Design a protein around this nucleic acid. Sequence first.
RNA 1: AGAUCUUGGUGGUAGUAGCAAAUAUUCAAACGAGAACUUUGAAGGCCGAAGUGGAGAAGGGUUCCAUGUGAACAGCAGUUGA
Lengths: 50, 31, 107, 153, 63
Amino acid sequence: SSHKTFRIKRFLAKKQKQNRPIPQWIRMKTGNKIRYNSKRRHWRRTKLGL
Amino acid sequence: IMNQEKLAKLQAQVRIGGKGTARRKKKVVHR
Amino acid sequence: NEVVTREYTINIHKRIHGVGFKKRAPRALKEIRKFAMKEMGTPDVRIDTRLNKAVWAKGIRNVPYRIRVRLSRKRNEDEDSPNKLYTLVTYVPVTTFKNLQTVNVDE
Amino acid sequence: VRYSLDPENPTKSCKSRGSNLRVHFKNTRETAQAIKGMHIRKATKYLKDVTLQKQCVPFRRYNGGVGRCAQAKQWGWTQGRWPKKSAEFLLHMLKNAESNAELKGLDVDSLVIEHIQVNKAPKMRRRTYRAHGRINPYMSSPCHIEMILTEKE
Amino acid sequence: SMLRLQKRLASSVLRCGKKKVWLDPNETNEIANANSRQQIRKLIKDGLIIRKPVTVHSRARCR
RNA sequence: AGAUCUUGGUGGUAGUAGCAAAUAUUCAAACGAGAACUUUGAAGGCCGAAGUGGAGAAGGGUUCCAUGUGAACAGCAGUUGA
Ligand SMILES: [Mg+2]
Ligand SMILES: [Mg+2]
Ligand SMILES: [Mg+2]
Ligand SMILES: [Mg+2]
Ligand SMILES: [Mg+2]
Ligand SMILES: [Mg+2]
Ligand SMILES: [Mg+2]
Ligand SMILES: [Mg+2]
Ligand SMILES: [Mg+2]
Ligand SMILES: [Mg+2]
Ligand SMILES: [Mg+2]
């Protein structure tokens, strides 16, 4: 909602920050074995547990 | 100053619709 | 010549008979396009917005029975399309439809 | 790359290939069987006619529920259709093959489609929603296409 | 090209609805450069953006 | 070889059922490789103030706003997009 508490806002802030693609140069590392960010979250597909 | 061709093209340039629509008043190109 | 302009009257009533209410005005313009294509032999037919408005003047289902149009075949020099000729069809307002023939018109 | 049916003489031949193309495999297979063996000019004209609904492709194997048409009588058959997307994809592959022939230096006015083949591609998954809270597949059926043209007059 | 943003801005500047915003169909390329409300005001002054009049709902029949 | 066996994959069905609740679209132009669907203009309509309007609470959590892309997604398409 528009009315939210500080803890809720901070939790949403962390989720928003960590929902982003991997940097391109990660795939160039030695023994990388990571293709994409499998933990991507869309607001409409999966809802936060909160 | 106005002339026959100037008014002939002005008639087309003014109407921006059919009957019952407001005629165009002005059109300027300025910097 | 191939840049001829002529004046026709189309029996929209005849061409639109039997069509349902919500499809009468659209099919009137489809039939006008077919008429222009058949009479001028150009697949590229462009309908003047005033003619479209005249066809749609009385709503979607009460289309005018007859329409007076002007088919002008023109050179499509605007671009290098496969159709080098197009036909612009324009509305000719009239007061009566009696004794109107297909007449060639000058410039 | 590995084509099936390598040409008998790969100096008067040109090849074209496409993978995971988003057209229906059955329609494309019928269109390929129709244009197989044609001259390249004849095939181009026929595919454009199929796009314009002036000539049809006869549906011979995958014809369950396919309706009848009058144009199917030129083919020795009864059921025909006008797969526009398949015709467009085959036209693009024909243009690619013609460009390859020009690069190889053999004249294109004598090219004949000697080999054409449509293979099933991996299916793309989508979702559909049914009556009582059920989920069913809504899969696509893309196809790989390959063709070899040769010169013969 | 596409003037979805310009019609939205002109509606706010003219303080009317998007029904009444008239964008010059011929000067499409000039209006497309107006990405700010200040540019919209300039186009409104220069006649490229016009507020169409209210649709006539006469009361003469009732009178 | 069986167990309405477990897991995975694949057929026929089948290019089939189907993409039919809430009246409705049309003309011209622009961009664009490409336009039934985008945008602009002109018409014709609908919601008809107990709204298909303007704003909030709960809930959502960045969906808001610009620019760009055209892979996938938006059960047709898209130059559009939550
Ligand atoms: Mg939900
Ligand atoms: Mg059957
Ligand atoms: Mg369903
Ligand atoms: Mg359910
Ligand atoms: Mg077994
Ligand atoms: Mg069916
Ligand atoms: Mg149905
Ligand atoms: Mg009403
Ligand atoms: Mg509301
Ligand atoms: Mg948005
Ligand atoms: Mg789709």
